[PDB]
């Protein structure tokens, strides 16, 4: 208290000091279900890929290890990650991930990025500007390029319109390039949109074939499909959780709220995920934050005494701050787990102040008609209910009058503020040195 007040002595009164939080005890990571999850990966290291405009699809889900394999998949490859950190892929359960594999030349590798232009970037492949995910591109000269010329891979250049992110065009119709009508016949003002690739091991790296794999995760709700590492439940204690990705701390408990079969998570009129269904045992949980609360100190003033009694505002202390473990709470001082007496008020509850019945006038306000003071029960801190004043019954009667016979010329005083200090500032002096 005197630390927050920045003074060596304090006065009679209750001073807010800090906040009290029940620290989590354990860690619950149920990261999958009755089974596991995986991306099947593998594809990464393979030869027969597809054309630039032929990215692949992989609704990968549950089977092998999501990761810890593909650092060695090839000597060198591209690891450009948008959003998630490259060191944190194994621990993040991506739900919706899209795996696109295709072959482009080295020169157009830089064109595989949001906000890029070129033969492929403008027309063939478009990456969204809000893209989150990673892209894998490695030199596949010694598995794609053919000595006689691997023309199986192809690219599109004479395309009229741009594609949207993850848009495709399988049509190989003749492109109408100019004013002269073609009627579907290539010739004047008409080029074939598709062009073959010159793929041969004896070629420049810029023109060398590069198998390009794109990972497009989606980092929001719904069940996931990929996370390397996990079990246990915990049903009544404040414990950290990692429900298939959702990372946070709360008190797990049973939920009487009924989920529809498709309902994965729950909420309230808030941001918090008030309810989550277990990744396994399809149980409806009632995730709630631990029992925290502001802690305030009631002191009669250092000068009078150095004994204090603390108040845990907004806490039912039948069990939360009385059964505090060794430094399980930010206040610490576990010797004050019970102290002198514990009393439950309507403004939290009182620790170290003994409740009495003899109501007095308010000395140190608490709340809900409770005050504290330091006097005899041989001096301690009491928690008397407020006394509103002396109960005086006026002897009213239909025929009786009370008339003063004397007087006192009382001279009271009153203090009223009138003006404050006339301060002035200076931007150029203050904001800028």
């Amino acid at each position, epitope marked *: 208290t005197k630390c927050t007040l920045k003074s060596f002595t304090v006065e009679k009164g209750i001073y807010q000091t800090s906040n009290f939080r029940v620290q989590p005890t354990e860690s619950i990571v149920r990261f999958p279900n009755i089974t596991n999850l995986c991306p099947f990966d593998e594809v990464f290291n393979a030869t027969r890929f597809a054309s630039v405009y032929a990215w692949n699809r992989k609704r990968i889900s549950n089977c092998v290890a999501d990761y810890s394999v593909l*650092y060695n998949f090839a*000597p*060198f*490859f*591209a*690891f*450009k*990650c948008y959003g998630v950190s*490259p060191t944190k892929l194994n621990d993040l359960c991506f739900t919706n991930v899209y795996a696109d594999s295709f072959v482009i030349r*080295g*020169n157009e*590798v*830089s064109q595989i990025a949001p906000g890029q232009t070129g033969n492929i970037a403008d027309y063939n492949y478009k990456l969204p500007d809000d893209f989150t995910g990673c892209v894998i*591109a490695w*030199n596949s*000269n*010694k598995l794609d390029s053919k000595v006689g010329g691997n023309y199986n891979y192809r690219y599109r250049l004479f395309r009229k319109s741009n594609l949207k992110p993850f848009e495709r065009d399988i049509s190989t119709e003749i492109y109408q390039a100019g004013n002269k009508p073609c009627n579907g016949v290539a010739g004047v003002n008409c080029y074939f949109p598709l062009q073959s690739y010159g793929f041969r*091991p*004896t*070629y*420049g*790296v*810029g023109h*060398q074939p590069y198998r390009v794999v794109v990972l497009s995760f989606e980092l929001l709700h719904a069940p996931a499909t990929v996370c390397g590492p996990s079990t246990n439940l915990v049903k009544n204690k404040c414990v950290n959780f990692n429900f298939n990705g959702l990372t946070g701390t709360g008190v797990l408990t049973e939920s009487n709220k009924k989920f529809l079969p498709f309902q994965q998570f729950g909420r309230d009129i808030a941001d918090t995920t008030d309810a989550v269904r277990d990744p396994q045992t399809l149980e409806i949980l009632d995730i709630t934050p631990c029992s925290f609360g502001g802690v305030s100190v009631i002191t009669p003033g250092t000068n009078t005494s150095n004994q204090v009694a603390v108040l845990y505002q907004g806490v039912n202390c039948t069990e939360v701050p009385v059964a505090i473990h060794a430094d399980q709470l930010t206040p610490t001082w576990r010797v004050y787990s019970t102290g002198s007496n514990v009393f439950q008020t309507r403004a939290g509850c009182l620790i170290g102040a003994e409740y009495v019945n003899s109501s007095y006038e308010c000395d140190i306000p608490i709340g809900a008609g409770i005050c504290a003071s330091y006097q005899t029960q041989s001096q301690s801190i009491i928690a008397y209910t407020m006394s509103l004043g002396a109960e005086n019954s006026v002897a009213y009667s239909n025929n009786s009058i009370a008339i003063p016979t004397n007087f006192t010329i009382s001279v009271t005083t009153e203090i009223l503020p009138v003006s404050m200090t006339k301060t002035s500032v200076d931007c150029t002096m203050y904001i800028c040195g």
Partner: nanobody
Framework: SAVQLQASGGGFVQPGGSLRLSCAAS????????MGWFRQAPGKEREFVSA????????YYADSVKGRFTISRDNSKNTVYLQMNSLRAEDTATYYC????????????????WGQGTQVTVSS
């Protein structure tokens, strides 16, 4: 990111001699960076030497290395060389094959990854 670089070459060159260095690339990188050597003169601060891009489209040279330095990357094993033409006698230094994990080299001072040094003396 974590990139392991395999640099090799060196020996004992003479005034007017030449080198054919090498620097193989392996490992995953956040971006397809450009290889090169980032050499200090003996007792001097580290300095940029010569740059080649992964696409074989961008080349860089410096005044202290002009006319006697050239960088080229192999198309087969992806080991970038340092082809030489009449190296002078004052290149008795250790050549470090550093790595810049950026698609464009706006400034050469920030280097993402370092390689192995190649100590070659130029004397007869």
């Amino acid at each position: 990111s974590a990139v392991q670089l395999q640099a090799s070459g060196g020996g004992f060159v003479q005034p007017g001699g030449s080198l054919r260095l090498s620097c193989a690339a392996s490992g995953w990188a956040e971006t397809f960076g450009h290889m090169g050597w980032f050499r200090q003169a003996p007792g001097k601060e580290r300095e940029f030497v010569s740059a080649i891009d992964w696409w074989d489209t961008v080349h860089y040279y410096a005044d202290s290395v002009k006319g006697r330095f050239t960088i080229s990357r192999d198309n087969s094993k992806n080991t970038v060389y340092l082809q030489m033409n009449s190296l002078r006698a004052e290149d008795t230094a250790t050549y470090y094959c550093a790595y810049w994990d950026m698609d464009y080299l706006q400034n050469s001072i920030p280097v993402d990854y370092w390689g192995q040094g190649t100590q070659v003396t130029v004397s007869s």
